[PDB]
Design a protein around this ligand. Sequence first.
Ligand SMILES: [K+]
Ligand SMILES: [K+]
Ligand SMILES: [Mg+2]
Ligand SMILES: [Mg+2]
Ligand SMILES: [Mg+2]
Ligand SMILES: [Mg+2]
Ligand SMILES: [Mg+2]
Length: 233
Amino acid sequence: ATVSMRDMLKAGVHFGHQTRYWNPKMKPFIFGARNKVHIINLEKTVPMFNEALAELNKIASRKGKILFVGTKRAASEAVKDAALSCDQFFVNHRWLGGMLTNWKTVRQSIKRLKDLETQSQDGTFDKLTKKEALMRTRELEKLENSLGGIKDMGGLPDALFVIDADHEHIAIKEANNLGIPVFAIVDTNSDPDGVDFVIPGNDDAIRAVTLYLGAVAATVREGRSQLASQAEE
RNA sequence: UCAGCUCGUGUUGUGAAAUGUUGGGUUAAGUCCCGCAACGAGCGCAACCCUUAUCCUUUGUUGCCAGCGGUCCGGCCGGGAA
Ligand SMILES: [K+]
Ligand SMILES: [K+]
Ligand SMILES: [Mg+2]
Ligand SMILES: [Mg+2]
Ligand SMILES: [Mg+2]
Ligand SMILES: [Mg+2]
Ligand SMILES: [Mg+2]
């Protein structure tokens, strides 16, 4: 695709963790070690990323919903920006256990967030007796921080794209439970067993994270434009 | 009158069960915040009730007497609404 080994090398995709923290299941994707730090095999990274991008493009063309999951402090704002410029949904703060498997309950929180936003736009807060308004705006802030990116999702997504599979093991487990395909960036210290589409690469570097997110956003934009509530655009 | 006791859905365990409800703080309080495979909800806590402590408005008799006028010195009388 558009991404090539050279720009991943520039970003730092090939850097992993220290050898003592590795998961032995990452041995096929590990190229070697330098200064007691693993080096991911970009020669394997590139085609796997291309295949994941193609599958994401197909999912977007079929009018599917893409959930971008990443809550690390180095990928939160990047994930939010990618999802916003891609018109898909995101979770960039702490994943609530049961967001997908207990969606019938998380829906009520989504509705409460919508109602609080409507009240804020109305102006019932200054009608309220000050302390109640402060409590309600604090609740609005908390609900926006938690479920801001899935407010308009309206149901289970058709695909998850995850940064730091190990950090988001709960989301990946829920997606495996529900049958939702998982594309994920898997570092050398992570277990790739639950991931349908593994992309070995650095998940701690802001440059690499932005590279992955930009490629995914671009490919899903093309996939969406392929249908766009029409025949072919 | 102790701050406790539970449920739904989700998740863990072959199972009895567990989690939530534990943890760091804080409170009279499972009180509240932060964290967190939990997300929410109910009965309890608190508040809504009565009374007491301050002020304002209205009303002023059988209750009151500051300014007045008398007076048998008793708000006693005419009055006054302070
Ligand atoms: K056991
Ligand atoms: K339960
Ligand atoms: Mg990493
Ligand atoms: Mg208990
Ligand atoms: Mg218990
Ligand atoms: Mg309580
Ligand atoms: Mg808790």
